[PDB]
């Protein structure tokens, strides 16, 4: 009904906010197309062969060795050794082999395999050995027969003779191409077994062993039987290699396509939680799921455009039968991409509930996307073994469930099916039960399994602002101080016996006890309250955050505990912060919030038009919410608070941090806008709580203390008036105090600061004021008084006294109210600043240990875990055993036919069936049977069927064809093995056996030294592995340098006088010291793994130099790149990426642009000269070229033959390791040492600023100006500030005279004011005095030193308190004071005392050692102004010293700032609150448009620019309908010129004109008329200082 209205109003907002960011939207649609258009290129760059049918092979003979051993070698005859020599049984078996393979072979005999293994490698004639028969029996030394169980080797050459090794390490090819292993070569192929002569020798040895036992039947049997060998015929096949590369490039190119729009979801979701906008909407009625639904319906509808396009350009027939995923039903591709999209949205929602900042979440949730894809590189190959449950459990990571589904799209596409909606359940081959339905299901299950984690972490760990819930929440289904309240007005908030008690003694909040307040309509009520006393528990119960305990409170006739859902209809409210979306207009916020508050669509626009008028923003309409102000945003927030008609209106601190005009505008707004509604303020200013507030309430200990109007409270909780004089040089305070006390008895000389003399005249003696003022009017010149005045108490005193009567804390008991050394210089200074700046940088590595566990632990793992995955070797082995017998594979299945008509087949088939070794028999009925079978079996044929048998006798001759599966390496031997194994049991007793082996010969000395030299795939692979771990380390140096400049902490330090060299050469020293712990922990790793290219010789001190030279060259480059960034976490992720692209990309763009005359690219010589300025490409190409030189040297040294080979082929190793033009690292050392010195120079040339330099004015102002041009002989020598004829002109397209001649002279014991209008130049004068800005035509003498010449000796004598908080969160309350006591001098023996007394002067001792992050927002303003006062400064430049502080702590600070001025200093305040420029000032100066318009103490200003008085009388309730006008007529008769100006329920407020009214006459008149006209109380006061300041408001140029 209306939920559907909110769900669309909340979706228009998201769509608008998101399409206003053009670079992100356009970059989210051009990644998933740039990454999927690559496949179109890669497909049109590859063709498919697709043989028709019928590839079959002929047969070979194994009777005689190939026609290569007929010719003898250069040298002698061939050799054939046997290893058991002493045994005669083996001695005679080899001789029949010799007389069966007659060439000239000489038979040798050896003791044992040790002797042969030493003969082959340690000789020069041991090169013509052909085979070597080895047995497995001790043989009972001299004579013994051969036991019927025989095993033996043959053992061999090592490299192909007739023509790589024998591949005994493996058993199937590692990278199987599609098709036959050797399409040509109809006899075996690569491993040998035919060309070499393995089979001929094996058959001969088998025949020898047969004749050794039969010798007679053998001749008969082999007279009518010969054995040949044939290869399987291979079926017609698809030859396309691209379909094999779709199972490793599709998943990665899908993930890399969605991985950006998967991290702009986390940022968008968390950025709106960080700004507390979701918390604001949740307090208007919107539930917490309306936001997730509106995020989902946007990002899903936005990913469905990319998925459709991706589906389209996968499956468009570019050319006849092309277009990757050619026959694959595009609807199913789309329906799989949509499930991937839902999963990758629901993943980001879950990720965004772990972070508070938007930068961190965006950076570190775009990384977990990748990090959840890793376990697929370890499942892509090992896929045929895994059981179903393990495969299904691996899918709980959505990025892996997608990849195992992108593999099936290749495994189906390489067969002709090409998934078609009707095989969702059918497995792939016949036996691997894992369909394509369990991919979609596991993709849509992880969505829910992630929703269940976000819904729990959003409710139990809400963050900093929300309120948590119990972890099991898914279980339960659930006096005389009070004035008389008005009678005309109707209550709009009624509270009765409200109460709340919190949890166990872990209080941490504030309790209310028995509140009985009451708030009325058409009236502003101000709710004050001391520090711990309720007042935010109360405003939380009323606004609906938690229920009460023992009370009830009605808002608009409802009750907060029963039906809050209807209260929130009229209750509008605006908080402390700002609730506005940047990138929406002024006109859109109102149209959004008016309707969200439940306003009809047809009747909205006129209220938007009216509210744009009430606020006063007709112009500046449809401006973004950025670019407005700081002072029209507080007006738009107030506008939102009361749009659509809202009765109750709870707004707090509405005028915080605003100048004095934008504050009166808001006051006037709120005064015109009540009239109908109840407003509840709460402020920290104690005159805003008085000027606009008609009824006030104060809470002290969770219990309402006093209530009533302002005049009611002031007459009850305050002392008398505040009469103030202005004494002159020839004056005596003693001669005036006698007058005052002798005339009025009770009084108090409150203070005599400056030249004021203020008293306290109690108000229970107002009948003597006639005499006092009449008498003191006369003796003006005789006494020395000029322009006195009087006023009544303030509201700060009332507030401070109420809480003092009913509290006992340490602070509130401190306030008092009226009752009832040579600084260092030269060398010590610089060496002291160096230490101070070194400790600051050092103490960050162990108070934030995320940088130690990421400088020491990331490089180590990144280097070891990826040396493991390479299997770094440094050693070579010698091709181990491989027993040639069926069974190392597994349970096979062996067919055999009997296409015979005669005998010699049946007995053989029965014996074969008696194998019972591996598989059964699987008899068939051959050549064509295999062709048919090898099309429906698929991969099963090449895993369960390796051999065959076919006994086809042509009458007498009985051939036995044995077939071998070429897809294996060692099949042609196993086939003959089984064939002759059974044919030997034929003419023997079947209790025997024959197995053999392969186990090739060991390498010689000259072969190992060449098979070790061809490990060139190690330098290039160990350089990339290290360049990738030095990019997660080089970036951690620009984090303190970014987060210190962003918080403005660097600006204050440079103002206080730190040197541009001590600042940076002290960061560099520590960043080099912190570049050895990893740089020395890498030697341990390279030693443990034994990487010899740089461990063996004195090279451990040559990698260390190469790593120090890289640290030295990249640290200063990472210092320069910090000037781009503002957040410490958007710089890490943008600088590691810069490192990786500057490194890997441009180092890999040179090695593979030099491939052995393939892609030519002779310009690599130019690229490797243009890339010599990047210090990552200079490390990669130095490590690689070190590892290469050492290898090619260690080779061309082992023997002379190698040296000759190197000479012929021009290998050119250098023996210096550091020379030029070589494999030596000379031009890389020399280019990293000269690049780290061209960055320091450029850093200092940026810091030291070599870019920006490559008319009746007033009587008192003129008096001041001409008092410092013609001074007394020594009138100005002991004074701090002597500004003289100071000016500054801009050149921004028009001469702007922002300062005009500014002649002033501040003295010891002063406190200058310097007020001004917005843009009057009060903020360039401040800068120009603190040394920041360029001067023009005039000087200033700060302490004795000119400000145009010696601007370095000045900065050591001035303190400076900024407006913002420029503190270093990793330091301590006391360490930050020690830092600044060192940057200024203060010999090391005094620092203890100078810090100890300051800390307890500001009352910071509890928090002295507390790590300034725990500090409340008001203990930071107490420390920023202890930093200003530490040391002995000549001048102090305070600037809004107490911004966000409550009244008690603010008073306690204004006290110290004045106790520091009593004892001979000079202060310069500059603030926006006119309440603070009176509590600590001695002389003021309003400044408009260029220059001073007035000057003098705040009383001399009120006399000279004041107008008159202001009455505030009230009349009792007796005849209020009759006495009010009777009094109101009298005050228009006896005071000609009054203005009524206000009226509220008992009271008036006049503006009695000051023309001809003494301070005596006005009191006599009212004191006589008090009783004759029935008045309850009254109070006369003079003009207010802020009202005097506002008089000059018309002098603004616009
Ligand atoms: C498993 C399948 C799916 C899993 C996805 C869902 C699980 C997500 C877990 C990952 C996040 C772990 C929790 C986490 O990050 O804590 C938050 C802080 C960031 O703080 P921050 O963002 O300032 O605000 C805190 C948010 N709050 C209030 C809710 C705690 O976290 C940090 O501060 C970031 C940590 C700094 C980097 C760590 C580097 C130190 C050493 C590196 C580790 C060993 C080196 C090899
Ligand atoms: C498209 C792919 C993009 C991703 C590619 C590579 C990006 C690397 C992801 C990790 C980035 C984490 C960023 C980070 O930790 O910030 C450095 C911290 C910030 O501390 P802090 O000053 O509290 O942060 C405030 C700044 N803020 C809010 C904007 C973050 O300052 C520190 O305290 C030092 C911590 C730095 C060490 C972080 C290194 C750990 C990364 C490896 C994590 C592996 C987990 C097993
Ligand atoms: C080859 O070996 C024989 C002994 O077998 C030895 O006499 C001869 O010096 C060797 N030749 C060379 C070149 O070392
Ligand atoms: C092998 O023959 C020897 C002949 O000297 C004899 O010790 C025994 O019969 C056999 N030895 C072993 C250890 O079986």
Swiss-Prot record:
Changing residue 1288 to N: In SMDP3; decreases phosphatidylcholine transport; increases protein abundance; does not affect folding in the endoplasmic reticulum; decreases proteolytic processing; affects lamellar bodies development; reduces free cholesterol transport. One of its GO terms (molecular function) is ATPase-coupled transmembrane transporter activity. One of its GO terms (cellular component) is alveolar lamellar body membrane. The ATP-dependent phosphatidylcholine transport is competitively inhibited by miltefosine. ATP 2 binds at residues 1316-1323. Changing residue 43 to L: In SMDP3; uncertain significance. This is Phospholipid-transporting ATPase ABCA3. It comes from Homo sapiens. The lineage of its organism: Eukaryota, Metazoa, Chordata, Craniata, Vertebrata.
